[PDB]
Every structure is written in structure tokens, then in C-alpha cells.
Amino acid sequence: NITIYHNPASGTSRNTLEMIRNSGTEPTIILYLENPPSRDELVKLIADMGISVRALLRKNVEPYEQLGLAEDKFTDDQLIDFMLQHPILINRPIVVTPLGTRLCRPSEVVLDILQDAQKGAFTKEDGEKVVDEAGKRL
């Protein structure tokens, strides 16, 4: 049982999704830009990811720029509420599996929390080899 908060316009998110599929399961796909998690769910995700709230903020997007979020003037809860009100601020992809939750940046972080091994070699879209045919992480 796997969930990915996916952005089809994200190379990182595309590579993650294909690595999930290459382990043999089709995840539930949540298009977070349109269907962001609830506040309770986002708080839980962040806790399980083991990263700070700020570390989840995506830079170089309109609300991060115009809300001045680069400056250290915001509590964690202020940032969480910005994320819910402006879901493009939530960096991507977040993946949930029975083993755990990770912000999969870079995409191959997902290999930590996938239960079943990659079924064959995996190469990212840009040709970066990630696992070879034997299953070794390059």
C-alpha cells in the first residue's frame, strides 16, 4: 500500500513514480497541487519524513518569492499553513509506504522505503543509471 504525492511536471516525481512501479506495485497517485493533504495529514507526513517544515518548502515558485519565505521570519505552523493554502510550496514527491515516508529528492531515496526490490535495472529519464540488472545501487 503505497501513496505518492505526485506532480507530473516534475522530473524527480516522474522518476520516483517509475521506480515505485519498477518494484512491482502501482501506487495511489495524489495530485497534491489539486488535492493537497489536510493539515492533520501534512503534519503527520512531515513528522514521519524526519525533516524540518522549512526543508519541505520548494524554492523558485511564486508564493515562496512573493511571501518572502526565504527570510527567517516564520514559525513552523505559519509555514505549514502557507503550504496548505499554496500547495506548489510543498516539495515533491512525498511517498508513503508500509515502511515509512520520505521526501524523495533525489528520486532514488524511494528505494529506502520500497519493500520489494527493483525488478530489473533502473535508469532515470536523463540516462543516470540508478540500479543495475543485478540490483546494485550505482
Residues at the interface with Cs ion (CB under 5 A): 38
For Cs ion, the closer of residues 65 and 112 by Cβ is 112
Contact indicator for 118, 131 with CB cutoff of 8 Å: yes
For Cs ion, the closer of residues 78 and 115 by Cβ is 115
Strand partners, 7: none
Alpha-carbon distance 17 to 38, whole Å?
22
For Cs ion, the closer of residues 38 and 60 by Cβ is 38
Nearest-approach distance from CB 41 to Cs ion, in angstroms: 6
Nearest-approach distance from CB 115 to Cs ion, in angstroms: 7
- What is the distance of C-alpha 121 from the center of its chain? 22
